[PDB]
């Protein structure tokens, strides 16, 4: 390796990220004054639990679809065997979304951009999972305090996804090599932009714990509403989480 080759990886990951975002950062910034009214909030709160679940799982699934496209443009990803591509996406895609959502989060009033306006965590009360919701919102507040650039999110999310410790990987060496090259590229970029102080502040088990809390909450919902899950949750969502 050499610096040019590492810096090429950085630019390639940032571009892949840019083309697979879904919502552009400037779009999200320009809507920050567009906040749900007390009555719109109340409207969300009065929705049935099963309806709120279906809507949320829909938007999450759409988000995950963009993560898949990001993966497919990640240098090295498509050269892994398909078994390993799937392992990495099953364990990683939700973690990616949870990192990517800090872009849509306004830490000044603790709201998130959801179905066209910003709203507070109380918007999601009808879900019945205040503890998970609260921890997601805190997680995003933590990440917002770092002031991630778009390049930092790109590189960090690549590393969330390319993790050679995922159980089930058939060629764990090949993934380790990819991961180490991505780690070098991220750290290189931080060293060049005088941002190495963030290394210390990145989250620890934390991403894992949020994804676990998601899955245990789903098993409770599907036990109480199994036909709703069968008939009205997206196929992709069930494939990743059920």
């Amino acid at each position: 390796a050499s610096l040019t080759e590492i810096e090429h990886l950085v630019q390639s990951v940032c571009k892949s990220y840019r083309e697979t975002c879904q919502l552009r950062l400037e779009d999200l910034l320009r809507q920050r004054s567009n906040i749900f009214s007390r009555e719109e909030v109340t409207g969300y709160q009065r929705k049935s639990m099963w309806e709120m679940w279906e809507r949320c799982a829909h938007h999450l699934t759409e988000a995950i679809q963009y993560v898949v496209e990001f993966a497919k443009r990640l240098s090295g990803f498509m050269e892994l065997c398909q078994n390993d591509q799937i392992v990495l996406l099953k364990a990683g895609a939700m973690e990616v979304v949870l990192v990517r959502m800090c872009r849509a989060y306004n830490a000044d009033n603790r709201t998130v951009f959801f179905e066209g306006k910003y709203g507070g965590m109380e918007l999601f009360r009808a879900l019945g999972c205040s503890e998970l919701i609260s921890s997601i919102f805190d997680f995003s507040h933590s990440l917002s305090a770092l002031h991630f650039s778009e390049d930092e999110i790109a590189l960090y999310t690549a590393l969330v996804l390319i993790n050679a410790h995922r159980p089930g990987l058939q060629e764990k060496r090949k993934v380790e090599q990819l991961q180490y090259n991505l780690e070098l590229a991220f750290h290189h970029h931080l060293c060049k932009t005088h941002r190495q102080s963030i290394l210390a502040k990145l989250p620890p088990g934390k991403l894992r714990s949020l994804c676990s809390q998601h899955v245990e909450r789903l098993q409770i919902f599907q036990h109480l509403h199994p036909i709703v899950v069968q008939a009205a949750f997206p196929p992709l969502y069930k494939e990743l989480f059920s």
């Binding site: 679809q65 898949v68 497919k72 398909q82 591509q85 799937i86 996406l89 099953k90 196929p235 992709l236 494939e239 990743l240």
Partner: peptide
Amino acid sequence: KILHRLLQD
């Protein structure tokens, strides 16, 4: 399976 298709297409 959906994943298979998204990865192939």
